Write an enzyme that holds these catalytic residues in place. Structure first.
Site, PDB file in Angstrom:
ATOM      1  CD  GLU A   1      -4.122   9.953   3.277  1.00 31.46           C
ATOM      2  OE1 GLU A   1      -3.838   9.931   4.256  1.00 31.46           O
ATOM      3  OE2 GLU A   1      -4.370   8.776   2.915  1.00 31.46           O
TER       4      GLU A   1
ATOM      5  CB  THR B   1      -6.199   7.555   6.367  1.00 31.96           C
ATOM      6  OG1 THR B   1      -4.340   7.956   5.284  1.00 31.96           O
ATOM      7  CG2 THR B   1      -5.875   9.886   7.149  1.00 31.96           C
TER       8      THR B   1
ATOM      9  CG  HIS C   1      -1.928  -1.017   1.011  1.00 27.88           C
ATOM     10  ND1 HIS C   1      -2.638  -1.664   0.228  1.00 27.88           N
ATOM     11  CD2 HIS C   1      -2.070  -2.092   2.213  1.00 27.88           C
ATOM     12  CE1 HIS C   1      -3.495  -2.743   0.794  1.00 27.88           C
ATOM     13  NE2 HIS C   1      -2.611  -2.881   2.400  1.00 27.88           N
TER      14      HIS C   1
ATOM     15  CG  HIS D   1       3.111   6.113   5.964  1.00 28.48           C
ATOM     16  ND1 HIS D   1       2.658   5.399   7.249  1.00 28.48           N
ATOM     17  CD2 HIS D   1       1.853   6.766   5.159  1.00 28.48           C
ATOM     18  CE1 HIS D   1       1.750   6.808   7.475  1.00 28.48           C
ATOM     19  NE2 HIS D   1       1.322   6.745   6.602  1.00 28.48           N
TER      20      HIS D   1
ATOM     21  CG  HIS E   1       0.617  10.334   7.291  1.00 31.03           C
ATOM     22  ND1 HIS E   1      -0.299   9.975   6.306  1.00 31.03           N
ATOM     23  CD2 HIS E   1       0.628  12.083   7.249  1.00 31.03           C
ATOM     24  CE1 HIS E   1      -1.091  10.599   6.235  1.00 31.03           C
ATOM     25  NE2 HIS E   1      -0.935  11.760   6.356  1.00 31.03           N
TER      26      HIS E   1
END
Ligand SMILES: C[C@]12CC[C@H](OS(N)(=O)=O)CC1=CC[C@@H]1[C@@H]2CC[C@]2(C)C(=O)CC[C@@H]12
Ligand SMILES: [Zn+2]
EC number: 4.2.1.1
Length: 257
Positions: free
Chosen positions: A103, A195, A61, A91, A116
């Protein structure tokens, strides 16, 4: 399994994770004119001088830069926080094009990417216990725009060739996350969630106002990563961002006038 595609992306997550439609979901749009300056908010204390990175991982991801969180080393405190939060990993989220990837948004502006830095509240003892608590995590969010290179990012960019595909990991010691911070620690803050699944409502978000600049070449190397494992049909790791969710009964506070 969940992901970022037409058939498994954010609009599907609620089926396996019903909290996706909850009261404190992230990310959100930050409406700069509605955010209230709060003179009670303290300066952010970012103490990364003793941070010990261990490893970098492609989890299918994103990629995570992992830290040794077994001692009080790399800690976030002050700002809106009570007590001390320990760095466990950072990340990014990024786009297929420079016009999307973040985001959080700022007055509906999308940045090219968002960093983040994830920290857990030491009063809950471990990561997994912290995410079960409404004040369990503090995530420091930093926008990326494309312009000048970020010299402190290049060590990350240069290791990505070795973790192209899902489940690949690499030794990643002595990485100093201070090299990813903008000049100003002015921030917005609000209560929210992870998230990605499991979307737990355990996060105090701290989003810095000042973006960092990275070069087009640096972000192009993010976009060469793969969501798929080694020996599977190639799906480029791009657009791994969740869109803005409803603010509902929340106030975004600003540390700055
Ligand atoms: C890694 C991840 C998901 C990705 C999130 O990304 S974000 N974008 O919200 O920071 C950060 C995050 C926090 C808690 C962590 C969870 C995955 C499942 C874990 C490991 C369990 C117990 C702790 C949980
Ligand atoms: Zn994230």
């Amino acid at each position: 399994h969940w992901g970022y595609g037409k058939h498994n992306g954010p609009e599907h997550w609620h089926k396996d994770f019903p909290i996706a439609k909850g009261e404190r979901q992230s990310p959100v749009d930050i409406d700069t004119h509605t955010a209230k300056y709060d003179p009670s908010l303290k300066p952010l204390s970012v103490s990364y001088d003793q941070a010990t990175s261990l490893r970098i991982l492609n989890n299918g991801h994103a990629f995570n830069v992992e830290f040794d969180d077994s001692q009080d080393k790399a800690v976030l405190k002050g700002g809106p926080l009570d007590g001390t939060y320990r760095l466990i990993q950072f990340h990014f989220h990024w786009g297929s094009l420079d016009g999307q990837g973040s985001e959080h948004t700022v007055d509906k502006k999308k940045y090219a990417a968002e960093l983040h830095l994830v920290h857990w509240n030491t009063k809950y003892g471990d990561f997994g216990k912290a995410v079960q608590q409404p004040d369990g995590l503090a995530v420091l969010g930093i926008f990326l725009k494309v312009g000048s290179a970020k010299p402190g990012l290049q060590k990350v960019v240069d290791v990505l060739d070795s973790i192209k595909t899902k489940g690949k990991s690499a030794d990643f010691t002595n990485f100093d996350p201070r090299g990813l911070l903008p000049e100003s620690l002015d921030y917005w803050t609000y209560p929210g969630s992870l998230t990605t699944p499991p979307l737990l409502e355990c996060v105090t978000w701290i989003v810095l106002k000042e973006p960092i600049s990275v070069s087009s070449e640096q972000v192009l190397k993010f976009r060469k990563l793969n969501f798929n494992g080694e020996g599977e049909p190639e799906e480029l790791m791009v657009d791994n961002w969740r869109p803005a969710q409803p603010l509902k009964n929340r106030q975004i506070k600003a540390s700055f006038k």
